[PDB]
Design a protein around this ligand. Sequence first.
Ligand SMILES: *[C@@H]1O[C@H](CO)[C@@H](O[C@@H]2O[C@H](CO)[C@@H](O[C@@H]3O[C@H](CO[C@H]4O[C@H](CO)[C@@H](O)[C@H](O)[C@@H]4O)[C@@H](O)[C@H](O)[C@@H]3O)[C@H](O)[C@H]2NC(C)=O)[C@H](O)[C@H]1NC(C)=O
Ligand SMILES: *[C@@H]1O[C@H](CO[C@@H]2O[C@@H](C)[C@@H](O)[C@@H](O)[C@@H]2O)[C@@H](O[C@@H]2O[C@H](CO)[C@@H](O[C@@H]3O[C@H](CO)[C@@H](O)[C@H](O)[C@@H]3O)[C@H](O)[C@H]2NC(C)=O)[C@H](O)[C@H]1NC(C)=O
Ligand SMILES: *[C@@H]1O[C@H](CO)[C@@H](O[C@@H]2O[C@H](CO)[C@@H](O)[C@H](O)[C@H]2NC(C)=O)[C@H](O)[C@H]1NC(C)=O
Ligand SMILES: *[C@@H]1O[C@H](CO)[C@@H](O)[C@H](O)[C@H]1NC(C)=O
Lengths: 261, 354, 286, 114
Amino acid sequence: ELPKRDPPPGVPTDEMLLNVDKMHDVIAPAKLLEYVHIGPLAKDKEDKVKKRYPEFRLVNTGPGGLSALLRQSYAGTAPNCCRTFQRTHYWKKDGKISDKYEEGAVLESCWPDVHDTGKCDVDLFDWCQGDTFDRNICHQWIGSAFNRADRTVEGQQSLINLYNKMQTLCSKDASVPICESFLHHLRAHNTEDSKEMIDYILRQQSADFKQKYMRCSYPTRDKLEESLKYAEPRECWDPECSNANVNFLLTRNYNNLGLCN
Amino acid sequence: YRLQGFTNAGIVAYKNIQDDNIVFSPFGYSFSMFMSLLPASGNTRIELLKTMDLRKRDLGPAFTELISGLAKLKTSKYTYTDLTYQSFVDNTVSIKPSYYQQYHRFGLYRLNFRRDAVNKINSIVERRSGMSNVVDSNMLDNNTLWAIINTIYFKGIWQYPFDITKTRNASFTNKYGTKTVPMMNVVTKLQGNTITIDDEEYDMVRLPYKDANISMYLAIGDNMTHFTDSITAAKLDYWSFQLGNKVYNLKLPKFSIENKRDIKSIAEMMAPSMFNPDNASFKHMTRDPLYIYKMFQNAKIDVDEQGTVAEASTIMVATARSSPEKLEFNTPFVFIIRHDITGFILFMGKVESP
Amino acid sequence: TLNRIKIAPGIADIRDKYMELGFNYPEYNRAVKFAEESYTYYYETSPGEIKPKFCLIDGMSIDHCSSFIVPEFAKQYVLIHGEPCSSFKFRPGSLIYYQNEVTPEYIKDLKHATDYIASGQRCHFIKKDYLLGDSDSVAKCCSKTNTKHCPKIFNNNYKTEHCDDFMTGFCRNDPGNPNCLEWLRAKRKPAMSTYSDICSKHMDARYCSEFIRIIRPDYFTFGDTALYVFCNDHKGNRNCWCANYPKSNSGDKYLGPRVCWLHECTDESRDRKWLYYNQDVQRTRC
Amino acid sequence: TPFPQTSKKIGDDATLSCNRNNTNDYVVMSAWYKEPNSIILLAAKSDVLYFDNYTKDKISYDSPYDDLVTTITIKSLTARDAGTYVCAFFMTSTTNDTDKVDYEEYSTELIVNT
Ligand SMILES: *[C@@H]1O[C@H](CO)[C@@H](O[C@@H]2O[C@H](CO)[C@@H](O[C@@H]3O[C@H](CO[C@H]4O[C@H](CO)[C@@H](O)[C@H](O)[C@@H]4O)[C@@H](O)[C@H](O)[C@@H]3O)[C@H](O)[C@H]2NC(C)=O)[C@H](O)[C@H]1NC(C)=O
Ligand SMILES: *[C@@H]1O[C@H](CO[C@@H]2O[C@@H](C)[C@@H](O)[C@@H](O)[C@@H]2O)[C@@H](O[C@@H]2O[C@H](CO)[C@@H](O[C@@H]3O[C@H](CO)[C@@H](O)[C@H](O)[C@@H]3O)[C@H](O)[C@H]2NC(C)=O)[C@H](O)[C@H]1NC(C)=O
Ligand SMILES: *[C@@H]1O[C@H](CO)[C@@H](O[C@@H]2O[C@H](CO)[C@@H](O)[C@H](O)[C@H]2NC(C)=O)[C@H](O)[C@H]1NC(C)=O
Ligand SMILES: *[C@@H]1O[C@H](CO)[C@@H](O)[C@H](O)[C@H]1NC(C)=O
């Protein structure tokens, strides 16, 4: 009294033979508001999947617990993310960060090119000011000086604020290594004529800087007259300033004094 | 969340048409009735919710169904159905701020009907769709403060192309001395059977369109006013179910029909308050008493050896011209254009050639 | 209850069928249009979607309607919620089309009366890209060893950031892969840092020449840092000693215009990877 | 202008999304327009309707499963495509049987330049 028909046997595809566990090199690298797919999940494990991924929110994609993880945030802390360009993401475990997955470690990713969006200019300025400056990172941190193509209201404001904030320190004392990398990058980083620190505080500096950080470029009166005498024996760095590296040279004094072929 | 009553309203509107050369678009009439629910309120809203079987809770899921059906209808380039809608409200009418914030992008436009009330409407319709001369100078007056326009376009290339060969037919029944209509004959595998509606034989065959879940169902029989009166969505579904595949030698005419129809009564029995100035409570649009005078449908259908091109325009206006009511023809066949998945019926009518 | 359990096959399609379900009362007799599935879907029902006439009953595995798709074709289709389906429990997988006298109100009434009808939802499959859910495969197809069965988000010639983290370590293991250079061409900070570290540890390989060629016009800092670090460990190198840390005199002089007059080296530049920006761009005009 | 102002470059797939404040009410309609009047696309559940001259090739709809968020991704950005995008939610209340609808409109500035 009933025409019965057993359903055909089910062939499971890749879309269902998954578990979020043992899937961590796919979940971690992702962008905002993208539905990267994980397999079916029970209601009990969902909380765990939520705890491991704070920037991600579980969305019920389909039946049988078919869910995806939607990224709505980038919880990247400054003293860990921008301190190392390598770290696209890190993992917290027992209060310590690591670059390798572990059971129970909480994922924390980073904004794409976070140094191009200026999230870290406040903290990186106060971290490696001295005694911990890294010739790798805080030297590449000034690569944004000509790579900031954010074109955003917040980003441009952050860039200008960083410029002025670090110009204060490079005005107080140039001998800071970060300022040294700054005058290294200042050759053509901002168009070709945007450099005037020559006349603000570097116009009148200490006498020791005459003998320690600007030898034949910022001379005394007798040495000022001697420098222009003959045919450039003191112009550029021939006589003794050649031994001193080209670290802190006034930009106007750079093209003018240092032009020896 | 169904549109069965939505299509049945247009089917009923087609049933009450008393003519022999009929070309009607149930989809356009149903679209006008269904989407006049947004400005409707109170009595007219319940009348428009009763004409199509849609309870108050089901309002909104029915709109998802309608928009999904429209998207499914626009799923191919060889065949497609375009549905457009425009509204025109007098500047002296102060539409509600919420209504403007909600549905002003869905065809609302402002203009006073005292000066240049027709050419601007025609230009707007020709801009947003492919219909021209849709509004004539005698269709809007100074009293009128509201106009509504709905447009349907169907283009379907035959899945099985119709071979072009020399064949013609002649008729001698009545109303004409001698008339010759072009004919064609093709041999192909198609789904067509011999079914009885109510102790009456009928040969019905389905012609499909390429890359489309749409079909044209042709029924031939002796007394087909009976067939017209026996049209429902269920009956058409049953006929499609029963009609099966076999080799057919089909002979068909390359007919072209134009039609203009007054819908006032046949759209009026179930919605008396939508046309009465003393009961048209269209409060979601405006506080002032605004009512609807008359409505008219213009339809064109062309069946060729490569496909079908159909156009329809439903107009809510003050008054308009009249059309002939007695065009008698013999041995016709009923055509119905139906999307198999959505269940919509786009065009139906009768021919004169065979 | 149910007295007429008549079935009616579809002449148009064997899948579409009718049931002339008669019951105890003349009020309850319905021509229910129900359609089963016997096809295997190697094609698309609608553009970008597959809707088998099978619809899962609430309380059934998702696998049953994943079978109606060929496994090769079903590698991209994800199953989501569909419109609610009413089914026949005695013949699971049934899809009761709502038409004419039969309505979801009547369907609910019949479900309340007896167990001939089961709820569910229509199997709606949408085509996204391939799905990459195993840790070995994301390492595999981003490295282009098997350019198959993985999403274009991991297989766009590194146009996105989806497989930078793993390939940082992958290129640390072996910079000789041309796909590693293709990834480096994407101009991303993790690639910048990993290649800077690799060059600092090993600049002798030719993998660094193309790297410095790629990055120099845009980013100076990574190349300069790698050049500074590498020369410190290998000071006596026959090629490092130009314009770098190990010059003849004390400290490291000749960093700038002093390189303009240099002739013994930095004139016919064998490899611009031993020099900073100042030693090359200003050099050309000198 | 509390609404976010997103900026992208030509050729990058710009993603614009909205979250409805009233998640309890049934969603009948998702809409994406460009000011002042043009309608870019319409969405009902998993089905998408295209108005004017717009196709899935130009602007897509990558939120078919989620209802709490409506999302559009635009590929091959053009300065013409740069503009202010309006994103509209139409809900109706399915708890009781009333005639009041819920409408939620959110603007978003998409700035594209070299
Ligand atoms: C709506 O109607 C549409 C009509 O075009 C349907 O979409 C198309 O459906 C076809 C299959 O019906 C899809 O698949 C293509 O079809 C043929 C395969 O047939 C060939 O091979 C078989 C043997 O395997 C043979 O019997 C035939 O004679 C053919 O030689 C090939 O062209 C392709 O390989 C492909 O499989 C089309 O892709 C599809 N067109 C689209 C999506 O644009 C659609 O299914 C209908 N919707 C329904 C029924 O719900
Ligand atoms: C085509 O068929 C229609 C409808 O079919 C008719 O009605 C069925 C119920 C059966 O009786 C069938 O055998 C019959 O063909 C015909 O229209 C119908 O015609 C009949 C007969 O004249 C009309 O009945 C009359 O109706 C009124 C009362 O309602 C009185 O004049 C008479 O007492 C008689 O009952 C019937 O109303 C009418 N239906 C309509 C017009 O909708 C149609 O005539 C036929 N065509 C041809 C050319 O034969
Ligand atoms: C968005 O939704 C929130 C949450 O419901 C609304 O905030 C509450 O709104 C109610 C309205 O009756 C007030 O009574 C509450 O005091 C509000 N709470 C808070 C914390 O603000 C909010 O008004 C909604 N609209 C917007 C524009 O945010
Ligand atoms: C909707 O109807 C329900 C019926 O239970 C009622 O509780 C609720 O208050 C109603 N809401 C409004 C806004 O009227």
